[PDB]
Enzyme design. Sequence first.
Site, PDB file in Angstrom:
ATOM      1  N   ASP A  15     -24.396 110.900  44.307  1.00  0.00           N
ATOM      2  CA  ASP A  15     -23.190 111.492  44.405  1.00  0.00           C
ATOM      3  C   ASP A  15     -21.790 111.322  43.167  1.00  0.00           C
ATOM      4  O   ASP A  15     -20.661 111.776  43.796  1.00  0.00           O
ATOM      5  CB  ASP A  15     -22.565 111.875  45.939  1.00  0.00           C
ATOM      6  CG  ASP A  15     -21.994 110.365  46.014  1.00  0.00           C
ATOM      7  OD1 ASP A  15     -21.856 109.001  45.619  1.00  0.00           O
ATOM      8  OD2 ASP A  15     -22.652 110.284  48.120  1.00  0.00           O
ATOM      9  N   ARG A  29     -17.328 112.133  41.745  1.00  0.00           N
ATOM     10  CA  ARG A  29     -17.329 112.039  43.555  1.00  0.00           C
ATOM     11  C   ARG A  29     -17.788 113.710  43.518  1.00  0.00           C
ATOM     12  O   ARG A  29     -16.656 113.707  43.140  1.00  0.00           O
ATOM     13  CB  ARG A  29     -16.263 111.080  43.781  1.00  0.00           C
ATOM     14  CG  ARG A  29     -17.021 110.887  44.901  1.00  0.00           C
ATOM     15  CD  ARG A  29     -18.399 110.657  45.303  1.00  0.00           C
ATOM     16  NE  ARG A  29     -18.320 109.758  46.902  1.00  0.00           N
ATOM     17  CZ  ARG A  29     -19.243 111.281  48.122  1.00  0.00           C
ATOM     18  NH1 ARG A  29     -18.979 112.027  47.621  1.00  0.00           N
ATOM     19  NH2 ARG A  29     -19.352 110.444  49.084  1.00  0.00           N
ATOM     20  N   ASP A  34     -22.309 113.036  51.462  1.00  0.00           N
ATOM     21  CA  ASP A  34     -22.444 112.058  51.227  1.00  0.00           C
ATOM     22  C   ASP A  34     -24.756 111.992  51.014  1.00  0.00           C
ATOM     23  O   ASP A  34     -24.519 112.389  52.156  1.00  0.00           O
ATOM     24  CB  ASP A  34     -21.611 111.446  52.914  1.00  0.00           C
ATOM     25  CG  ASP A  34     -21.775 110.294  53.148  1.00  0.00           C
ATOM     26  OD1 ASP A  34     -22.018 109.355  52.061  1.00  0.00           O
ATOM     27  OD2 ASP A  34     -22.190 109.887  54.204  1.00  0.00           O
ATOM     28  N   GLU A  37     -27.078 104.768  50.249  1.00  0.00           N
ATOM     29  CA  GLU A  37     -26.791 104.136  49.191  1.00  0.00           C
ATOM     30  C   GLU A  37     -27.814 103.832  49.149  1.00  0.00           C
ATOM     31  O   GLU A  37     -29.065 103.547  49.138  1.00  0.00           O
ATOM     32  CB  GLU A  37     -25.947 102.637  50.159  1.00  0.00           C
ATOM     33  CG  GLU A  37     -24.937 102.731  50.695  1.00  0.00           C
ATOM     34  CD  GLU A  37     -23.624 103.656  49.951  1.00  0.00           C
ATOM     35  OE1 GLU A  37     -23.558 103.069  48.804  1.00  0.00           O
ATOM     36  OE2 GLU A  37     -23.439 104.471  50.309  1.00  0.00           O
ATOM     37  N   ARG A  75     -12.062 108.421  41.563  1.00  0.00           N
ATOM     38  CA  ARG A  75     -12.686 109.064  40.686  1.00  0.00           C
ATOM     39  C   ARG A  75     -12.231 110.362  40.899  1.00  0.00           C
ATOM     40  O   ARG A  75     -11.203 110.433  41.626  1.00  0.00           O
ATOM     41  CB  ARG A  75     -13.953 108.641  41.313  1.00  0.00           C
ATOM     42  CG  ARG A  75     -14.718 107.376  41.292  1.00  0.00           C
ATOM     43  CD  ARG A  75     -15.509 107.263  42.552  1.00  0.00           C
ATOM     44  NE  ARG A  75     -15.110 107.082  43.996  1.00  0.00           N
ATOM     45  CZ  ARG A  75     -16.137 107.480  45.299  1.00  0.00           C
ATOM     46  NH1 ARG A  75     -17.020 106.985  44.831  1.00  0.00           N
ATOM     47  NH2 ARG A  75     -15.509 107.571  46.032  1.00  0.00           N
TER      48      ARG A  75
END
Length: 129
Positions: A15, A29, A34, A37, A75
């Site tokens: 993302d 971003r 979401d 990770e 970002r």
Amino acid sequence: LHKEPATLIKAIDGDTVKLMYKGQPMTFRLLLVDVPEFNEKYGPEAAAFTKKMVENAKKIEVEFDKGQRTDKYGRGLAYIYADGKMVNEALVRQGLAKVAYVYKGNNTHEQLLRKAEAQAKKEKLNIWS
Ligand SMILES: Cc1cn([C@H]2C[C@H](OP(=O)(O)O)[C@@H](COP(=O)(O)O)O2)c(=O)[nH]c1=O
Ligand SMILES: [Ca+2]
């Protein structure tokens, strides 16, 4: 909302992407999403998905919403489009992202993503599996 040109500098993860916007480098971003990770399940696949989408594109566009354009980390916050297809929406549709970080003033495409999320879940795709 309006689409502005940008060019890929570098894919980063599911993302985030490094883009040149108005001649300056910046990490964007993706709004409203979401992704896991890199070290978490589906994290690598999310990154690989976004990477391919943006690297294969002939034309990357950025679309700011009506609210904040930069986050606390500097970002950019935008909808990103690869040859007219929205990356944010694509990840969600593939079950590689969840709808998330929905703040008012920056939620134009919320119902669109939720629809995609509804259908990802119905198919038990990726994170919904
Ligand atoms: C998507 C998004 C994230 N963020 C912030 C919230 C989180 O703050 P915290 O780091 O304090 O938790 C962080 C999550 O980004 P990542 O999911 O890229 O880590 O980015 C915004 O402030 N605005 C947004 O529109
Ligand atoms: Ca993330």
